[PDB]
Enzyme design. Structure first.
Site, PDB file in Angstrom:
ATOM      1  NE  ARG A 321      -2.870   1.242   3.516  1.00  0.00           N
ATOM      2  CZ  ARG A 321      -3.978   1.683   4.385  1.00  0.00           C
ATOM      3  NH1 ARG A 321      -5.051   1.873   3.911  1.00  0.00           N
ATOM      4  NH2 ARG A 321      -3.807   1.584   5.736  1.00  0.00           N
ATOM      5  CD  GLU A 412      -8.975   5.531   2.519  1.00  0.00           C
ATOM      6  OE1 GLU A 412      -9.218   4.973   3.722  1.00  0.00           O
ATOM      7  OE2 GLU A 412      -7.578   5.723   2.101  1.00  0.00           O
ATOM      8  CG  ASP A 440      -8.431   7.311   5.960  1.00  0.00           C
ATOM      9  OD1 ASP A 440      -8.003   8.524   6.521  1.00  0.00           O
ATOM     10  OD2 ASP A 440      -7.809   6.299   5.577  1.00  0.00           O
ATOM     11  CG  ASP A 611      -5.263   3.388  10.430  1.00  0.00           C
ATOM     12  OD1 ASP A 611      -6.075   4.151  10.734  1.00  0.00           O
ATOM     13  OD2 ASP A 611      -5.604   2.634   9.363  1.00  0.00           O
TER      14      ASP A 611
END
Length: 701
Positions: A321, A412, A440, A611
């Protein structure tokens, strides 16, 4: 401090790493590669910059619109006028090829691990096979007189064993009797299992797919269900197997079918030394020689119900990613000082690295010869088009055939959601997945409509009309674009690390909603979530959802404003207290230790695995409540100060923030995220965070 190449000043560590470690084996001329880079960066940077500015122009327009005011009718007409809501394309089918069957065919769990952590990255890759017994025994799935003491408790053991036998029954049923009464397994021709007063076979013989040992007394029986493999380990001599009435010592589930090595929201990488660490780990995975010996697992051998030896993959098929379009990084600085865009940098460097995973010369990732890259935080289909353009330019510099570098689109951002079909169409020959998240997306939701009024509480967002439509819309679009036998439809991450029973209960909703994959926080959680793909026939479900349009553009755009009166003073306090705790608990670790992910106890002391997205939502909500006068600056300071020593509490094992907050770089970072969060581009957190991690690192020198 740097190496001049064309108009670029590359950091020496980065230069040295690419030349000494990355380049050899790829047949790419070092000097050519470097001019290639120089070229791509110069060519794509103003477009990259054009896209980023369009984001701010749009948000500005939206901010003003709300300030002059809800008429949901003209609102949607305004978005159309400004170029935010675009026309929906004609129907189409994605055409992506050369993709591994882990992606196109198998529905299964998907792990995400911070690339900077080789230990976690190693386990993630080795998590494709996982012991069900270990997973049941160690977690709260089996309840505790089966308590976990310093020694093995046989009581917990047969509870574990019972649970597993039942799992087999529901998954690979026998024509008569249950696996709980099995006494032995033999392979006549096919898989016959001995019962006490009987002998029976698999109700559908195709579920038998191989074994080890000798057909009379096999060491293990390989089974398959919904494309996922189940392996019964048979060893009567072993301690567990001695007390099992068929000598079974374990059951092994094919679990984390794919993994995402994360350079984005789960790490802290703010200069050139951090990036190299990441790239080096990504290198080791691709060549297949990373270790700590704990090695990457080699593949697995078996015997068909009457035939030769076949090999199954033993490692999790790896995606990487990359970081998104926003950030710059001083690992490469231009002649006149400007940091190069991090995302462009990631495309070249992680793409170059991935070339090693395409062959053995020891371990191979993709077997069909694709590089799999997840791109986060895109806003709209012009942003998708640019990413695909970035990839095609990269594949030229690398010598790779066009369409080698596949894309997983993260859905997102709001502007991606309401233009999803078109976003998909822009990547129609590269896309191998879409995916939805709570965190997000909600952050973006709050920021885009920041000016419209105060939002409902964080816990309450989970049930809002906008988010329910967004989840369903994602699946519908994927399916309508023909994803079923071609790409993944993915859903978000389970963040409660310790609540495994709860996870087994609730996370089943995701494959039931037709998601071919979903995110889990660990190898253990991966194994447990694999149970769900056995209970739920996802391909069947995806087939049932065909042609269904369960979400209207009007629903997607329902802004989550809190109704008037709304909350009582103590509810508001709990909300800001909870948000300030989430920010601090995460930010203290990010800034002081460069640890982007770990288990932060929340207010109610639950261990959450969050995260950077949690930063985005917590901060944007507070800035929202600030802006509309729900709370004051006097309120926010207070909680941030109250919660600070309690974060300090939860961190025995570090440098305290209390009582001298104003000299704590973390406490300043967390505070800045709040008070100026309304000014951050789309409420992004990287700018404030990267600055402060750099600031703190200049205290360590």
């Amino acid at each position: 401090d740097r190496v001049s190449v064309g108009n670029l000043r590359i950091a020496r560590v980065l230069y040295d790493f690419v030349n000494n470690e990355a380049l050899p084996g790829t047949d790419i001329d070092p000097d050519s590669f470097w001019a290639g880079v120089d070229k791509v960066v110069a060519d794509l940077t103003p477009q990259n910059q054009a896209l980023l500015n369009a984001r701010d122009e749009l948000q500005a327009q939206i901010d003003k619109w709300h300030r002059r005011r809800i008429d949901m009718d003209a609102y949607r007409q305004f978005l159309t006028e400004i170029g935010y809501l675009l026309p929906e394309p004609d129907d189409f089918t994605i055409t992506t090829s050369g993709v591994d069957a882990e992606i196109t065919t198998t529905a299964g769990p998907q792990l995400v691990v911070p690339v900077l952590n080789a230990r976690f990255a190693l386990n993630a890759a080795n998590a494709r096979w996982g012991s069900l017994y270990d997973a049941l025994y160690g977690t709260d799935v089996i309840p505790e007189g089966a308590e976990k003491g310093p020694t093995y408790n046989k009581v917990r053991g047969d509870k574990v064993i019972a649970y597993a036998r039942k799992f087999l029954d529901d998954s690979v049923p026998l024509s008569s009797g249950s696996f709980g009464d099995a006494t032995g397994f033999t392979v006549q021709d096919q898989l016959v299992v001995a019962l006490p007063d009987k002998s029976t076979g698999l109700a559908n013989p195709g579920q038998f797919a191989g074994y080890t040992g000798a057909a009379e007394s096999p060491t293990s029986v390989l089974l398959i269900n919904h494309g996922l493999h189940i392996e019964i380990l048979i060893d009567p001599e072993s301690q567990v197997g001695t007390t099992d009435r068929a000598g079974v010592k374990d059951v092994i589930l094919e679990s984390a079918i794919t993994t995402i090595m994360d350079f984005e929201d789960s790490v802290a990488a703010v200069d050139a030394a951090d990036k190299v660490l990441g790239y080096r780990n990504w290198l080791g995975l691709n060549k297949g020689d990373l270790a700590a010996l704990r090695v990457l697992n080699r593949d697995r051998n078996y015997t068909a119900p009457g035939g030769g030896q076949f090999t199954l993959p033993g490692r999790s098929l790896m995606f990487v990613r990359n970081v998104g379009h926003l950030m710059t990084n001083d690992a490469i600085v231009d002649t006149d000082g400007s940091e190069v865009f991090e995302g462009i940098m990631d495309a070249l460097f992680t793409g170059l690295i991935a070339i090693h995973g395409l062959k053995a010369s020891p371990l191979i990732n993709s077997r069909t010869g694709s590089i799999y890259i997840v791109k986060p935080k895109m806003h709209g289909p012009a942003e998708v088009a640019f990413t695909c353009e970035l990839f095609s330019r990269v594949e030229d510099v690398l010598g790779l055939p066009q369409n080698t570098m596949k894309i997983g689109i993260m859905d997102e951002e709001r502007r991606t959601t309401v233009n999803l079909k078109a976003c998909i169409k822009a990547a129609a020959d590269r896309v191998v997945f879409i995916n939805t998240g709570f965190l997000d997306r909600t952050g973006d939701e709050i920021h885009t409509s920041m000016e419209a009024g105060p939002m409902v509480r964080k816990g309450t967002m989970k049930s809002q009309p906008w988010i329910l439509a967004y989840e369903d819309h994602n699946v519908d679009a994927g399916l309508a674009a023909g994803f079923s036998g071609r790409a993944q439809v993915g859903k978000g991450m389970w963040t409660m690390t310790e609540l495994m029973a709860d996870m087994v209960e609730t996370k089943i909703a995701q494959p039931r909603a037709g998601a071919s994959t979903a995110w889990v926080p660990s190898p253990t959680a991966a194994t447990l979530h694999a149970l769900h793909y056995h209970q739920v026939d996802v391909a069947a479900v995806q087939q049932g959802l065909a042609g269904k349009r369960r979400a209207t553009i009007e629903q997607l755009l329902t802004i989550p404003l809190a109704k008037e009166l709304a909350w009582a003073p103590d509810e508001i306090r709990e909300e800001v207290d909870n948000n300030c705790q989430s920010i601090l608990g995460y930010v203290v670790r990010w800034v002081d230790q460069g640890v982007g992910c770990s288990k932060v106890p929340d207010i109610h002391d639950v261990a959450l695995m969050e995260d950077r997205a949690t930063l985005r939502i917590s901060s944007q909500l507070l800035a929202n409540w600030l802006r509309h006068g729900v709370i004051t600056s006097a309120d926010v300071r207070a909680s941030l100060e109250r919660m600070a020593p309690l974060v300090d509490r939860q961190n025995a094992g570090y440098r305290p923030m209390a009582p001298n907050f104003d000299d704590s770089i973390a406490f300043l970072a967390a505070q800045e995220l709040i008070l100026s969060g309304a000014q951050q581009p789309n409420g992004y957190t990287e700018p404030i965070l990267h600055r402060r991690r750099r600031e703190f690192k200049a205290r360590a020198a």
